[PDB]
Design a protein around this ligand. Structure first.
Ligand SMILES: CCCCCCCCCCC(CCCCCCCCCC)(CO[C@@H]1O[C@H](CO)[C@@H](O[C@H]2O[C@H](CO)[C@@H](O)[C@H](O)[C@H]2O)[C@H](O)[C@H]1O)CO[C@@H]1O[C@H](CO)[C@@H](O[C@H]2O[C@H](CO)[C@@H](O)[C@H](O)[C@H]2O)[C@H](O)[C@H]1O
Ligand SMILES: CCCCCCCCCCC(CCCCCCCCCC)(CO[C@@H]1O[C@H](CO)[C@@H](O[C@H]2O[C@H](CO)[C@@H](O)[C@H](O)[C@H]2O)[C@H](O)[C@H]1O)CO[C@@H]1O[C@H](CO)[C@@H](O[C@H]2O[C@H](CO)[C@@H](O)[C@H](O)[C@H]2O)[C@H](O)[C@H]1O
Ligand SMILES: CC(C)CCC[C@@H](C)[C@H]1CC[C@H]2[C@@H]3CC=C4C[C@@H](OC(=O)CCC(=O)O)CC[C@]4(C)[C@H]3CC[C@]12C
Ligand SMILES: CC(C)CCC[C@@H](C)[C@H]1CC[C@H]2[C@@H]3CC=C4C[C@@H](OC(=O)CCC(=O)O)CC[C@]4(C)[C@H]3CC[C@]12C
Ligand SMILES: CC(C)CCC[C@@H](C)[C@H]1CC[C@H]2[C@@H]3CC=C4C[C@@H](OC(=O)CCC(=O)O)CC[C@]4(C)[C@H]3CC[C@]12C
Ligand SMILES: CC(C)CCC[C@@H](C)[C@H]1CC[C@H]2[C@@H]3CC=C4C[C@@H](OC(=O)CCC(=O)O)CC[C@]4(C)[C@H]3CC[C@]12C
Ligand SMILES: CC(C)CCC[C@@H](C)[C@H]1CC[C@H]2[C@@H]3CC=C4C[C@@H](OC(=O)CCC(=O)O)CC[C@]4(C)[C@H]3CC[C@]12C
Ligand SMILES: CC(C)CCC[C@@H](C)[C@H]1CC[C@H]2[C@@H]3CC=C4C[C@@H](OC(=O)CCC(=O)O)CC[C@]4(C)[C@H]3CC[C@]12C
Ligand SMILES: CC(C)CCC[C@@H](C)[C@H]1CC[C@H]2[C@@H]3CC=C4C[C@@H](OC(=O)CCC(=O)O)CC[C@]4(C)[C@H]3CC[C@]12C
Ligand SMILES: CC(C)CCC[C@@H](C)[C@H]1CC[C@H]2[C@@H]3CC=C4C[C@@H](OC(=O)CCC(=O)O)CC[C@]4(C)[C@H]3CC[C@]12C
Ligand SMILES: CC(C)CCC[C@@H](C)[C@H]1CC[C@H]2[C@@H]3CC=C4C[C@@H](OC(=O)CCC(=O)O)CC[C@]4(C)[C@H]3CC[C@]12C
Ligand SMILES: CC(C)CCC[C@@H](C)[C@H]1CC[C@H]2[C@@H]3CC=C4C[C@@H](OC(=O)CCC(=O)O)CC[C@]4(C)[C@H]3CC[C@]12C
Ligand SMILES: CC(C)CCC[C@@H](C)[C@H]1CC[C@H]2[C@@H]3CC=C4C[C@@H](OC(=O)CCC(=O)O)CC[C@]4(C)[C@H]3CC[C@]12C
Ligand SMILES: CC(C)CCC[C@@H](C)[C@H]1CC[C@H]2[C@@H]3CC=C4C[C@@H](OC(=O)CCC(=O)O)CC[C@]4(C)[C@H]3CC[C@]12C
Ligand SMILES: CC(C)CCC[C@@H](C)[C@H]1CC[C@H]2[C@@H]3CC=C4C[C@@H](OC(=O)CCC(=O)O)CC[C@]4(C)[C@H]3CC[C@]12C
Ligand SMILES: *[C@@H]1O[C@H](CO)[C@@H](O)[C@H](O)[C@H]1NC(C)=O
Ligand SMILES: *[C@@H]1O[C@H](CO)[C@@H](O)[C@H](O)[C@H]1NC(C)=O
Ligand SMILES: *[C@@H]1O[C@H](CO)[C@@H](O)[C@H](O)[C@H]1NC(C)=O
Ligand code: NA
Ligand code: NA
Ligand code: NA
Length: 926
């Protein structure tokens, strides 16, 4: 029998036990992790982007549960269906010479710009647009199945300038037009645009106040409204010898959607996008989110190239391809083991596509501890040459293992702090990436020291070319000693000799970053709808369509310019709750009816009439010359009763003789009659969105809905939508507080989905960042046991963060979903170089603060720079990517390494050289 008396003896005496047991546990996690759970589905990028458990979120979830469960023999109905049954017992533009339809937002389309920046209103450009449509769309084998038709002989014509010129100038097609048709149609537009600008000319005049010349085919209206950019025909542009057409649109007679993807993938995806006359600058085929998964999985080639560069750096630093490959195996194993823990142990069903971004992060930050442990091992061999391997192991762990933990933990804690967000995808990403970071640490203090012991024991001897080897060894020596001279002589001189320059420069940058973040221009919230969220780089044609061209065309602007009033919907008899799993996007739970509700009592009838009339007297209510007889159903019912006659006994309980507080049995009787009477007398039809009573399976009223229109207009601005929400919710809450028992539990809902998202981005970032800062300063104290070093560190970290976040604001980032996570993660990353220099400063033998800074830079500079570099390189490799999340994360990684390294190496070490503690000054007791 044999057994090691300590962990340092286990690593030294039995390395193969540690590596064998680790490899076994890893292949078990790999096998069970791929065999047991359902694989991730990335087909919707926006899955999990709704807050869950917010007041507004639960009411919004509840109102959606009510709408899916309303209908014949559903949980709820608009119609009393038991009563309904119980009563029922008693192309060529000369020959054809029209377009098949008006252009619309439902058709597949492309935006053209000029090659070489000239105006598109010329015969070469006009034909080149028709040429691209024929060449790239109508030619495709499934166009003929997808296109609209008048007969099986041919598809409909496309809507483009050349075909409007052909129909107006009696040509057969765009290909047969001549230069006189182009200038004639310009003179027609340039003179008739007046009546479009003034609002007289309109869609269907083929309006008689406009000269007939204009109204032909609706062509002048359709060109100006659909096909040309808004700046073309305005009084400011039209007085030019030729007005400048910068952009034009083409519409295809095929519908937007997943049917477009073969046409896209064959003819557009790998295309040059230019004919040499004109360039396709925007595409709207209805396939942006449907193409996401392909680009997402293809772009995994750049994280793979990043692994090869991080292997080169680490092999040159360690001088060992064995230690290097075994270190990268442990890095990748931490992603596998974290995935097994996440899906099998923690039981997360949802895996957001941002969990794939954890590979880039771990490739970048995974090897930092290997640089530390290898440096400390080499220092330990040098300062104890005659040590037994278990003593060389224990001394190496005594020096390295805590520093390695505080640096891993502060970044993991920053990821886990995002689990306070209400947004499901943010919480799921925080838990997965935080777990991979901690699993990577466990491997760096088990696997990696056992690998270092096997290397030491065997591979120092075991496992023309000899010339190439000797020449390579000579270059590797030169790089070693040049780097040693830099970190141990050059860099300490540059930091210390210019300390008063550095303190002024880095403090001025800190004040500048704080002004940009806290004063002007501050970081903004997202400013477009969730279905308009960017997924590709902004140069992609699908993103340029949304970011530029939706502003420049009149038919697209009409959708923005709409004066849409906020609805005020008030629901009783249902509980506003989210009984689904808040970590699963597809688990919305079931509708919960309220058992204390009662509309039918005389007191409930009386109060809910008075609520309707008191609400109509508010300044938030919009009065209309058209009455709405749906809005408050009890007024329309009271009105109907006051028009019922009494000479037939079959109508008697419903008589006009009855005072309004109807006996409970007359209310639930005559309401059913009134609802059935409506359905055939008026012919008005009730759908799941219509306000009224809701009946259950055997016709008892289990819910009531009211709806009113507001003065407040729907906006994407946070500050104004917060004033609508606070004004109406606090008035309705105050008014409800005096309601009868059985109406005091009602609730208000409206189009608040985007405001709830904005409110959760703002809240979750503040809390996750406050938690991330609290952990960073706490471990800084517990690492250093000195308040002065801990103050200089947290001030350098604060300057790092203000410069990092102010730089993201100058680059034009908003506080959207992944951006909001990077801001707490900045804190967690920014810790590391200040804790490493801070421990080297206290460790220093030298009594004088200058000698302590020289020892700190000398000992620690090499490993700190290798860590910064491998993270910067992992970020730089993501820059060719098509997926926007990969380019945003790689941009953040480069920037935060530069700022973090500069503030740690120069500013923090200059504070230590000017006023760093000596003896026991600032030291904390036990
Ligand atoms: C958390 C992990 C999530 C994993 C999710 C699953 C991903 C599965 C698909 C991964 C994937 C890339 C490789 C990724 C490696 C890293 C994997 C992860 C490991 C950790 C990092 C497989 O790529 C495959 O690689 C094979 C070779 O390995 C190759 O084999 C061939 O040669 C053999 C030899 O002669 C021969 O024998 C065999 O017969 C051949 O066919 C296949 O043809 C090829 O499809 C998909 O991309 C494929 O390749 C291209 C890449 O550029 C990609 O290019 C486009 O987009 C790029 C991006 O914008 C861009 O750069 C390119 O310019 C652009 O053109 C292609 O569209 C796509 O087809
Ligand atoms: C789940 C409930 C859903 C309710 C759905 C309601 C649907 C709308 C019907 C409401 C209704 C019938 C009610 C039938 C009984 C229903 C009982 C139900 C009870 C259970 C809840 C109310 O009928 C009202 O009757 C009153 C008398 O009782 C009468 O009052 C007066 O009395 C004396 C002169 O007769 C006088 O001397 C006295 O001074 C007055 O006071 C009003 O003038 C009259 O409008 C008919 O109102 C008409 O509705 C039209 C659209 O159908 C609507 O059309 C316009 O607007 C449309 C856009 O909106 C648009 O598209 C149309 O193009 C447009 O032309 C009219 O503008 C509207 O006028
Ligand atoms: C070498 C690699 C794989 C790095 C990680 C090594 C270990 C630290 C991991 C690998 C598998 C993990 C185990 C996977 C499954 C479980 C079952 C789980 O079982 C319980 O009964 C939990 C009950 C509860 O929820 O309270 C407890 C944690 C445990 C042992 C895990 C603890 C941590 C383990 C041993
Ligand atoms: C790769 C994973 C998935 C499974 C590995 C399972 C076993 C095949 C491993 C686990 C622990 C290993 C053992 C750990 C320690 C040693 C002591 C080692 O002793 C020595 O002094 C080296 C002698 C030599 O081989 O020259 C001999 C191999 C052995 C028995 C190892 C053989 C292979 C073992 C049984
Ligand atoms: C990035 C991940 C996927 C790497 C996974 C690596 C493993 C498949 C392991 C198992 C056995 C290892 C090999 C065992 C022995 C050697 C001999 C070794 O010979 C040397 O001259 C070592 C010199 C030195 O490093 O000091 C070079 C590495 C290599 C091929 C090892 C490289 C890493 C291997 C292939
Ligand atoms: C760093 C790596 C080595 C470990 C990361 C943990 C893996 C065990 C997980 C994380 C994400 C998973 C992938 C997520 C997505 C896909 C695409 C899927 O193929 C599709 O085309 C899915 C189509 C669809 O369902 O819509 C095949 C499985 C795969 C590669 C999964 C395989 C297992 C992966 C790599
Ligand atoms: C999820 C589970 C598997 C994680 C459990 C943690 C362990 C895998 C690691 C993490 C850091 C390791 C420690 C890092 C540093 C040291 C100091 C080292 O040296 C001393 O204690 C010197 C004592 C002396 O001789 O005076 C001994 C091993 C030890 C305790 C290590 C023991 C194993 C630890 C606790
Ligand atoms: C990417 C960010 C976040 C981290 C930045 C780290 C750099 C400041 C480090 C990484 C590698 C370092 C280099 C490694 C080796 C050398 C050789 C060294 O050569 C000498 O001192 C002269 C030797 C001779 O005279 O032969 C000069 C500095 C330099 C370029 C170093 C400068 C500092 C570098 C660029
Ligand atoms: C630290 C901040 C400002 C951002 C990163 C620094 C870089 C922008 C580099 C590029 C060129 C560098 C400069 C190149 C040459 C010199 C002269 C050098 O003069 C000395 O007296 C050196 C003495 C010695 O050799 O020991 C002092 C540092 C300085 C200003 C360097 C400081 C760091 C600089 C500005
Ligand atoms: C103290 C040091 C160590 C770290 C820096 C912390 C804060 C001073 C900064 C960094 C990022 C800032 C946040 C970035 C973005 C926003 C969105 C912003 O939302 C708005 O409504 C802005 C106007 C609008 O968009 O309508 C509210 C402030 C907030 C949370 C900021 C509050 C102040 C924060 C947390
Ligand atoms: C909100 C935060 C991110 C920025 C503002 C922080 C300031 C309120 C404090 C915190 C630490 C202070 C620094 C602590 C130490 C020094 C070194 C000190 O050096 C000397 O006095 C050198 C000359 C001499 O020794 O006589 C000069 C002031 C300075 C930069 C201080 C200036 C004011 C600082 C930056
Ligand atoms: C290519 C080799 C031979 C020279 C590398 C020179 C370096 C100084 C590297 C380090 C960072 C690199 C930059 C990192 C990022 C970008 C952004 C990239 O644009 C994008 O992909 C947009 C990214 C985003 O949208 O977030 C264009 C190249 C550029 C300037 C890179 C150019 C080359 C740089 C300056
Ligand atoms: C020496 C260290 C600092 C690492 C250097 C990394 C470089 C090799 C990277 C940094 C920026 C990269 C470039 C950033 C952006 C692009 C645009 C990209 O354009 C595309 O059309 C493909 C991507 C897409 O379609 O989204 C082609 C590669 C290229 C030049 C990249 C090639 C690789 C570069 C030069
Ligand atoms: C933007 C920030 C975050 C990172 C910048 C990293 C490097 C690009 C900078 C940091 C310090 C700079 C160095 C500061 C001093 C020198 C010494 C200078 O002179 C010599 O090498 C000879 C010195 C002698 O022995 O006399 C040449 C430029 C160099 C290497 C500089 C090149 C650019 C360096 C490596
Ligand atoms: C802490 C310092 C001493 C060194 C850190 C690395 C530097 C190379 C970083 C820090 C701040 C960065 C700057 C922060 C902000 C901007 C504005 C940014 O955006 C714009 O000017 C607007 C672009 C647009 O039109 O959208 C372009 C890059 C730039 C100059 C950055 C370039 C790289 C800088 C100088
Ligand atoms: C349209 O132009 C006429 C003059 O031709 C002008 O009287 C009228 O006020 C304009 N329309 C509007 C909405 O002002
Ligand atoms: C591709 O686009 C360029 C302009 O960027 C144009 O000159 C060239 O003719 C186009 N076609 C091909 C096949 O390169
Ligand atoms: C009425 O419907 C409920 C289920 O919603 C059922 O429990 C009850 O037995 C039904 N009563 C009659 C008389 O149909
Ligand atoms: Na790194
Ligand atoms: Na670490
Ligand atoms: Na950290």
């Amino acid at each position: 029998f044999k057994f090691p008396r300590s962990y340092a003896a286990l690593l030294a005496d039995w390395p193969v036990v540690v590596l064998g047991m680790c490899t076994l546990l890893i292949v078990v996690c790999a096998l069970v992790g791929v065999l047991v759970p359902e694989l991730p589905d990335f087909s919707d990028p926006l899955l999990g982007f709704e807050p869950r458990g917010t007041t507004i979120g639960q009411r919004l979830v509840t109102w959606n549960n009510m709408m899916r469960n309303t209908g014949y023999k559903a949980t709820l109905a608009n119609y009393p269906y038991k009563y309904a049954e119980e009563q029922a017992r008693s192309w060529n533009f000369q020959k054809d010479s029209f377009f098949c339809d008006v252009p619309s937002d439902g058709y597949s389309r492309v935006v053209f710009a000029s090659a070489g920046g000239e105006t598109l209103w010329n015969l070469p450009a006009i034909k080149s647009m028709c040429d691209v449509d024929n060449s790239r769309i109508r030619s495709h084998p499934q166009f003929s199945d997808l296109c609209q038709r008048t007969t099986a002989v041919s598809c409909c014509p496309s809507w483009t300038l050349g075909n409007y010129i052909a129909i107006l100038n009696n040509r057969s097609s765009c290909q047969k037009i001549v230069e006189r048709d182009v200038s004639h149609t310009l003179k027609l537009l340039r003179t008739c645009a007046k009546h479009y600008q003034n609002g007289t000319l309109g869609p269907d005049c083929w309006c008689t106040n406009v000269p007939r010349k204009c109204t032909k085919y609706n062509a002048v209206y359709q060109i100006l409204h659909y096909l040309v950019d808004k700046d073309f025909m305005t009084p400011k542009t039209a007085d030019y010898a030729v007005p400048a057409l910068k952009y034009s649109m083409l519409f295809s007679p095929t519908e937007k959607g997943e049917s477009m993807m073969n046409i896209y993938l064959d003819n557009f995806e790998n295309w040059n996008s230019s004919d040499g006359i004109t360039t396709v600058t925007g595409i709207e085929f209805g396939i942006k989110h449907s193409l996401f998964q392909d680009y997402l999985l293809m772009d995994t080639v750049y994280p793979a190239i990043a692994i090869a560069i991080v292997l080169l750096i680490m092999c040159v630093y360690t001088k060992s391809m064995f230690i290097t490959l075994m270190t990268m195996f442990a890095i990748i194993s931490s992603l596998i083991v974290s995935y097994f823990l996440y899906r099998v142990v923690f039981n997360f069903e949802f895996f957001p596509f941002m969990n794939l971004t954890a590979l880039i992060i771990l490739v970048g930050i995974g090897a930092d501890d290997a640089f530390v442990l290898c440096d400390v091992w080499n220092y330990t061999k040098f300062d104890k040459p005659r040590a037994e391997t278990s003593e060389a192991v224990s001394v190496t762990l005594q020096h390295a293992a805590l520093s390695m933990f505080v640096t891993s933990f502060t970044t993991a804690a920053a990821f886990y702090a995002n689990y306070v967000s209400n947004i499901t995808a943010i919480r799921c990403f925080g838990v997965y990436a935080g777990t991979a970071i901690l699993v990577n640490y466990v491997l760096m203090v088990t696997w990696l020291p056992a690998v270092i012991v096997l290397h030491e024991r065997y591979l120092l001897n075991i496992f023309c070319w000899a010339v190439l080897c000797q020449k390579c060894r000579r270059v590797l020596f030169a790089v070693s000693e040049a780097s040693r001279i830099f970190f141990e002589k050059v860099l300490p001189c540059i930091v210390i000799k210019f300390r008063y320059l550095w303190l002024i420069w880095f403090l001025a940058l800190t004040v500048g970053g704080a002004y940009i973040v806290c004063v002007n221009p501050k970081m903004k919230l997202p400013s477009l709808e969730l279905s308009e969220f960017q997924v590709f780089r902004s140069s992609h044609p699908f993103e340029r369509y949304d970011a530029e061209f939706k502003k420049l065309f009149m038919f697209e602007r009409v959708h923005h310019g709409e004066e849409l009033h906020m609805p005020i919907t008030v629901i009783w008899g249902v509980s506003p709750e989210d009984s689904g799993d808040p970590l699963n996007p597809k688990s919305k739970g079931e509708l919960t009816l309220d058992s204390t509700f009662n509309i039918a009592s005389p007191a409930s009838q009386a109060w809910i009439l008075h609520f309707c009339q008191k609400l109509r007297n508010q300044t938030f209510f919009h009065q209309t010359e058209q009455q709405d007889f749906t809005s408050c159903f009890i007024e329309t019912f009271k009105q109907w009763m006051e028009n019922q006659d009494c000479d037939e006994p079959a109508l008697y309980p419903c008589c006009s003789h009855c005072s309004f507080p109807y006996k409970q049995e007359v209310f639930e009787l005559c309401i059913k009659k009134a609802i059935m009477e409506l359905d055939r007398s008026t012919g008005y039809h009730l759908n799941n969105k219509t306000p009224g009573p809701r009946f259950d399976i055997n016709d008892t009223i289990r819910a009531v809905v009211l709806e009113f229109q507001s003065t407040f207009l729907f906006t994407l601005a946070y500050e104004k939508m917060q004033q609508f929400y606070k004004e109406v919710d606090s008035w309705i809450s105050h008014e409800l507080s005096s309601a009868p028992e059985g109406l005091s539990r009602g609730w208000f809902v409206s189009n608040l989905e985007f405001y709830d998202l904005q409110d959760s981005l703002s809240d979750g970032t503040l809390i996750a960042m406050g938690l991330s800062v609290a952990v960073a300063f706490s471990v800084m104290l517990l690492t250093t046991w000195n308040i002065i070093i801990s103050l200089y560190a947290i001030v350098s970290i604060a300057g790092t963060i203000f410069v990092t976040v102010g730089s993201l604001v100058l680059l034009g980032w908003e506080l959207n979903v992944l951006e909001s996570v990077t801001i707490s993660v900045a804190v967690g990353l920014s810790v590391d170089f200040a804790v490493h220099y801070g421990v080297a400063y206290r460790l220093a033998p030298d009594p004088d603060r200058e000698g302590k800074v020289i020892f700190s830079l000398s000992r620690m500079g090499s490993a700190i720079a290798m860590a910064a570099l491998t993270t910067f390189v992992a970020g730089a490799m993501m820059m060719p990517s098509t997926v926007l999340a990969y380019t945003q994360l790689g941009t953040f990684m480069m920037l935060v390494m530069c700022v973090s390294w500069a503030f740690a190496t120069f500013f923090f070490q200059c504070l230590c050289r000017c006023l760093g503690p000596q003896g026991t000054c600032g030291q904390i007791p036990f």
